[PDB]
Structures are given as structure tokens and as C-alpha cells.
């Protein structure tokens, strides 16, 4: 809840979205190989490991073509970020990555 609200605050300020809009969440489990960058998956010992993913969606998020997400590996926070308008993965946070 707190991390969700932090992600929401960050995204709404970064893209000038309405602060009061309700966000909904879709949770999906998938191996890191299909989600995270290739070399990051290899160097982070995440190959063939299931990530618990949370993708957030709303009306303005749909109009903005943005998918904010939070990725966990079991109980380890892996990534916080969003897929942008150009279908690229932008990271607010990536485990053991400075300036992702």
C-alpha cells in the first residue's frame, strides 16, 4: 500500500496526472527472463526465477499509454517503474542498479 502510493505519487508528478484518480492493480507471475533486461537478468541471478508483478491501470494511465509496475522476487523488491508511451521499460528502482 505504501509502496503503491509512492509509485502513484512519483508517476502522477512525473507525468502531470490527476493525483486523486483511483488506480487498480493486476498481478501476474512471470519469469524474469521475459520481463527484465537480458544482461540484468543474467548478472542478477534471476534466470528462470518467478517474479510477482503488479501492473497498475486507470483512465488517465490508459490515455497516457503508461503501465506503472512493481516487481518482486518472493519477498525481495526487484523493480519499481513504468512502461512509457514508446513501449520501453523505465525504472524508478532496480535492485543493485545505480542510475537505471
Amino acid at each position: 500500500m505504501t509502496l503503491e502510493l509512492q509509485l502513484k505519487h512519483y508517476i502522477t508528478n512525473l507525468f502531470n496526472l490527476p493525483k486523486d484518480e483511483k488506480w487498480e492493480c493486476e498481478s501476474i507471475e512471470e519469469i524474469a527472463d521475459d520481463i527484465l533486461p537480458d544482461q540484468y537478468v543474467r548478472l542478477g541471478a534471476l534466470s528462470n526465477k518467478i517474479l510477482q508483478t503488479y501492473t497498475y491501470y486507470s483512465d488517465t494511465l490508459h490515455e497516457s499509454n503508461i503501465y506503472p509496475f512493481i516487481l518482486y522476487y518472493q519477498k525481495q523488491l526487484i523493480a519499481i517503474g513504468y512502461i512509457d508511451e514508446n513501449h520501453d521499460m523505465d525504472f524508478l528502482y532496480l535492485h543493485n542498479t545505480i542510475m537505471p
Binding site: 507471475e29 503501465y67 509496475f69
Partner: protein
């Protein structure tokens, strides 16, 4: 007594559960009721087997596997589907977009209720049928896996010429249950936008462009079965 299984009559006949497996399913349902007494569980009791009430086993044409239900109230009893009042979630949005891109007559609907697919024989089966409110995967260990695997295996062994759309690692884990000599098994990445990005190292084809729905209809026609009208979504 069999009606306590919450399954439609023809589904109870088709699965033909032994007394031991019937007792196991009933114990799991009692677990769900006891959990509901103190916590919120999605979907409601009358929706756990909603797929069995939407169509009979003889009508099954395409089987689409989900994971666990939506954990924030969107779940309806079918995989991926949401109530007509709810927003279309990202994975279902990507499914609808692939349909729009691949099927000519298809137009993206304004809602995400897939009951029309289920009535046509599209089994939208979550592999875990329940989830606790706000807690994704919280029922991973309850014991839904044996039951949904049993449903998949029964469809594989007692029916013929069906199509299985396995998307993502969790759904593809159920590949050994399906007889690929009797049924078509189409495999691709999860439709979630998180799996659609470039620069990854997936082992399965991208979901955008997988054309699984047209390929499923082609398989059904080639075996003299009625196709699925994916466009009926309103």
C-alpha cells in the same frame, strides 16, 4: 450430495471424480467458506465454477489458462474476465488488441466481460480458483492445483480436437497435462505489457502477433468443429 461440488451436472458427469477426490474438493470448499468467515476471498462462492455453468464439457473448444483471480475485486470466476462495470486490465487489454490486429471482424469492446466467450466454449480457467483480497497468490498452497490440473487432464483425455492457449510460464507449466497428439497447444509469452518489451530473453513467441485465436479457429474448422466468434463481447 454431488450438487455441493458447485459444478454443473454435465461437468460432474464428465469429470467423474472418485469419492476421495470429491471429498478433497469439498474439504477445499469448506476451507474457502471458513476463510470467508474472517477474510474476503475472490471470487464469490457461486463464481468458483462459473466456467462450468457458462458451458458444458461437450462445447469446449479453446482452453485459456489463467493464474489466480484478480485480487482487488475484479474477478468474475473466469480467467482474465472482469465485470462490465470495471476497467479492462492490462493483460485483457493486450488480448483485445491482438484480437483487433489479427481478426478482421473483431472490434475492441468497451468492457472486459468474457461470458460470451465462455458460452461459446472458451474455457477461461484460472489455475488457482481463489485469492484473498489485496493479496496476490495468497492461495498458492491451498490446493487448487490438483483440481484445475484434473480439469485440464480430463479435457485432454476424454475430449478431442481442442485448442490450448498457454501464455506465460505458469500456464505453460501445464503443458505436460495436455495430449499434444489429440489437441493443438499454442504457446506464447504472457499477454501482460510487462512481457511485451524488447531486449529480453524469452523462450516463447511474443504475444502481439501470435495469432492464437485465428490459429485456434483454423484448427477447429479443420476438425469439423464450429469456430469461436471472438468478436462477441457485448
Amino acid at each position: 450430495d454431488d450438487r455441493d461440488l458447485l459444478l454443473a451436472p454435465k461437468w460432474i458427469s464428465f469429470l467423474s471424480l472418485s469419492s476421495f477426490l470429491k471429498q478433497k474438493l469439498l474439504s477445499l470448499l469448506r476451507q474457502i467458506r471458513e476463510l470467508r468467515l474472517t477474510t474476503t476471498v475472490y471470487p464469490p462462492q457461486d463464481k468458483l465454477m462459473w466456467w462450468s455453468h457458462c458451458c458444458d464439457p461437450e462445447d469446449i473448444k479453446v482452453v485459456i489458462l489463467g493464474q489466480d483471480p484478480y485480487h482487488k475485486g475484479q474477478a468474475t470466476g473466469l480467467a482474465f474476465s472482469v465485470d462490465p462495470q470495471c476497467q479492462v486490465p492490462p493483460s485483457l487489454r493486450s488480448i483485445f488488441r491482438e484480437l483487433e490486429a489479427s481478426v478482421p471482424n473483431f472490434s475492441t469492446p468497451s468492457h472486459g466481460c468474457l461470458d460470451s466467450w465462455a458460452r461459446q466454449g472458451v474455457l477461461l480457467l484460472n489455475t488457482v480458483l481463489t485469492v484473498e483480497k489485496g493479496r496476490a497468490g495468497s492461495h498458492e498452497g491451498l490446493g487448487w492445483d490438483w483440481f484445475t490440473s484434473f480439469i485440464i487432464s480430463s479435457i485432454s483425455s476424454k475430449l478431442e480436437h481442442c485448442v490450448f492457449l498457454l501464455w506465460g510460464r505458469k500456464a505453460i507449466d501445464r503443458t505436460p497435462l495436455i495430449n499434444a497428439q489429440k489437441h493443438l497447444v499454442l504457446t506464447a509469452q504472457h499477454p501482460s505489457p510487462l512481457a511485451s518489451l524488447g531486449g529480453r530473453h524469452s523462450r516463447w513467441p511474443r504475444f502481439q502477433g501470435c495469432n492464437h485465436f485465428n490459429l485456434a479457429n483454423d484448427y477447429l474448422t479443420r476438425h469439423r468443429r464450429e469456430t469461436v466468434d471472438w468478436g462477441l463481447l457485448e
